[PDB]
Design a protein around this ligand. Sequence first.
Ligand SMILES: *[C@@H]1O[C@H](CO)[C@@H](O[C@@H]2O[C@H](CO)[C@@H](O[C@@H]3O[C@H](CO)[C@@H](O)[C@H](O)[C@@H]3O)[C@H](O)[C@H]2NC(C)=O)[C@H](O)[C@H]1NC(C)=O
Ligand SMILES: *[C@@H]1O[C@H](CO)[C@@H](O)[C@H](O)[C@H]1NC(C)=O
Ligand SMILES: *[C@@H]1O[C@H](CO)[C@@H](O)[C@H](O)[C@H]1NC(C)=O
Ligand SMILES: *[C@@H]1O[C@H](CO)[C@@H](O)[C@H](O)[C@H]1NC(C)=O
Ligand SMILES: *[C@@H]1O[C@H](CO)[C@@H](O)[C@H](O)[C@H]1NC(C)=O
Ligand SMILES: *[C@@H]1O[C@H](CO)[C@@H](O)[C@H](O)[C@H]1NC(C)=O
Ligand SMILES: CC(=O)OCC[N+](C)(C)C
Ligand SMILES: [Ca+2]
Ligand SMILES: [Ca+2]
Lengths: 68, 202, 135, 93, 189
Amino acid sequence: TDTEERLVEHLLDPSRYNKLIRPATNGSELVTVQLMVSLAQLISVHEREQIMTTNVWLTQEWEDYRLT
Amino acid sequence: TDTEERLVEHLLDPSRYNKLIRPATNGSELVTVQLMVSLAQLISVHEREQIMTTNVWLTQEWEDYRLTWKPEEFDNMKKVRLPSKHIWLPDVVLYNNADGMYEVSFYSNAVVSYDGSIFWLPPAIYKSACKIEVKHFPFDQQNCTMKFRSWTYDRTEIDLVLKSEVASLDDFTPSGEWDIVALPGRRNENPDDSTYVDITYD
Amino acid sequence: TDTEERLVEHLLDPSRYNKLIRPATNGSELVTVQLMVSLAQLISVHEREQIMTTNVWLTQEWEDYRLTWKPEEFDNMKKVRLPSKHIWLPDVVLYNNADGMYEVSFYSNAVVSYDGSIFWLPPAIYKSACKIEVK
Amino acid sequence: ETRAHAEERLLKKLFSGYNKWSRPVANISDVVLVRFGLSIAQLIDVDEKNQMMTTNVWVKQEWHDYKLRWDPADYENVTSIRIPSELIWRPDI
Amino acid sequence: ETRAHAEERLLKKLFSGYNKWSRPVANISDVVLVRFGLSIAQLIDVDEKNQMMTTNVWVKQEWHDYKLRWDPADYENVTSIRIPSELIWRPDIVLYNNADGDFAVTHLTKAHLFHDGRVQWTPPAIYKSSCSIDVTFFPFDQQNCTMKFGSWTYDKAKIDLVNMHSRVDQLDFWESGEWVIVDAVGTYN
Ligand SMILES: *[C@@H]1O[C@H](CO)[C@@H](O[C@@H]2O[C@H](CO)[C@@H](O[C@@H]3O[C@H](CO)[C@@H](O)[C@H](O)[C@@H]3O)[C@H](O)[C@H]2NC(C)=O)[C@H](O)[C@H]1NC(C)=O
Ligand SMILES: *[C@@H]1O[C@H](CO)[C@@H](O)[C@H](O)[C@H]1NC(C)=O
Ligand SMILES: *[C@@H]1O[C@H](CO)[C@@H](O)[C@H](O)[C@H]1NC(C)=O
Ligand SMILES: *[C@@H]1O[C@H](CO)[C@@H](O)[C@H](O)[C@H]1NC(C)=O
Ligand SMILES: *[C@@H]1O[C@H](CO)[C@@H](O)[C@H](O)[C@H]1NC(C)=O
Ligand SMILES: *[C@@H]1O[C@H](CO)[C@@H](O)[C@H](O)[C@H]1NC(C)=O
Ligand SMILES: CC(=O)OCC[N+](C)(C)C
Ligand SMILES: [Ca+2]
Ligand SMILES: [Ca+2]
């Protein structure tokens, strides 16, 4: 939609949103990231090479005050 | 943080910082680069092909006088991360590699201090050729070397120096098939070249 | 030379030449592309995998009316080399390839004549799938 | 007048204010119907020991973009064009 | 006054109107003389079964660009600079008899540019070339594997190659322990 395109252009505008900078309001503030691993499939275990191959969906949740 | 965005925009402003120019002024002085290899893991030593695969961090430190700021003017900010691809880097690579992979693997961010000190710690996966001594196999001890040079600048432009005399094992995971004995580092010049310098780890 | 670089800037000027648009002229016409494969070496035939590996030079020729110039205005230059990545190419690929590599390997220059003739001869290492008869 | 010039004008018009990150629907409640199909080029391998199938397929997709419409009468009867797929919104199948 | 400012001024002046897609000759009839040489870092693998040789070489190239010239007196006595090789014109030297590798150089290191227009570009390259393998006297066999280098789209009237040195440079060679290089000479054809 026109509104969605307008919002996406507003949010990602490189003029006002720098994607290389941590979204911390204060210098000493820290960003909390929530992690959860979903094991979709254990593809293999290689005893000789000592490697486990898995298919996992890695949930990651945090807050970005600049994307409001 | 708005202050960090302002500082990052100020430091890398193209009108005042060009990454194609080596940070050496008042004549062609030397940019001293401190090297320190930290061995994360000894992946393998394929004896048949004579290739040792290692996972290391190529710690590098130098001084860029163009990346300084006053902490008082930036909310007392004394360090900032800058993308390594946007600042001048000493193109230190693995010269004695096999498979022709010279550069680091990721090109991570560099940590800049307010006095112009750059601290870069990129990860690298290196497949270095080494000479296999088969005389005492299977009770054999191997001496595989990794030679580091800059494939851009010679000794007259950058000086390679050793941060410490041994490679660091602060974040090492034992291999299970090979046992680390010693990881000394040495800085090698050439008495009859004056433009050659390399740092080799045994 | 100054004239050569002037010509190159004039031809590839994005404001007048778009490389995403087919050089079709006279209406809803079609661009005729001439192919010629030159076998430089039969690197290998892998019977167990049923893959043939060849080193070939793939001659591709077509006419782009947008890359025309008058030799008089450009110091009587009759042809120039243009980077093939900056002109319209017919996306000619090897369909029956194995290993999922469709395009040519190098992307050399394309030799462009003053009348719009384009001569492209890139080298390629191709791995094609073929049916091995074991009888 | 030439088809190439009309196509250049059309390309300028279509992507003037186009956003490739926004779902291409005129109304938020609308659903993008993606006609999906597979055309198998070859069954490269069936690795029984590792329990994997390697296939070479063509992933046929087809949707509608409401901001990529035009009248061919205004562009020398240009009815369709080939554009890089990285310039437009695509489903993330 | 400082060298960095002079270098910035020089870099701005050089690339003001520089076209990297144009052969760098003042006169169209002029030939770009490219001095070509090889330096073998190591002989990674000789594959008798597949008839391929893998080498780690440094492709030493040197030519003249008439637009990348300056007077060092006007730039704080700056006599040379290192510039990315993707900013300038380079010859398209490729390995004809490639097999399972890359035809052209892909590393694209920085080029050493001198005040008189000379450009030295010495990128590394891993090449996997084809060579016929003669195993009549195996394991006492001696192989003769060749590498053919030349520009792909510029004829002799536009780019000409010059042997920097007869013999392939072996000063930085990594001895393999399986093969010894009896002879390694480049021949102009
Ligand atoms: C592992 O391999 C390296 C490289 O082959 C060996 O390095 C070499 O070691 C010898 C003996 O220590 C060095 O010779 C000595 O150099 C010193 C320093 O100038 C000199 O004072 C002595 O008179 C003698 O010439 C040699 O320079 C050195 N070469 C390199 C390139 O480092 C190393 O010894 C081997 N280590 C083990 C445990 O096998
Ligand atoms: C979008 O669709 C909903 C559901 O039919 C409708 O209520 C709404 O008015 C539509 N919006 C517009 C702008 O037509
Ligand atoms: C437009 O082109 C189509 C073919 O794509 C053709 O069938 C139709 O008759 C043409 N119409 C006009 C007005 O040229
Ligand atoms: C280029 O060289 C040719 C051959 O000597 C000469 O005839 C011609 O005048 C030269 N062009 C210029 C502009 O000097
Ligand atoms: C310029 O630098 C060169 C070394 O690159 C030196 O030999 C020469 O004396 C210098 N000239 C001046 C005027 O400083
Ligand atoms: C090696 O091959 C080259 C070209 O094929 C030939 O000129 C040369 O004489 C050969 N040398 C030997 C020792 O066979
Ligand atoms: C013009 C052109 O691209 O020629 C390529 C083939 N070669 C190197 C034999 C001339
Ligand atoms: Ca199988
Ligand atoms: Ca071998």
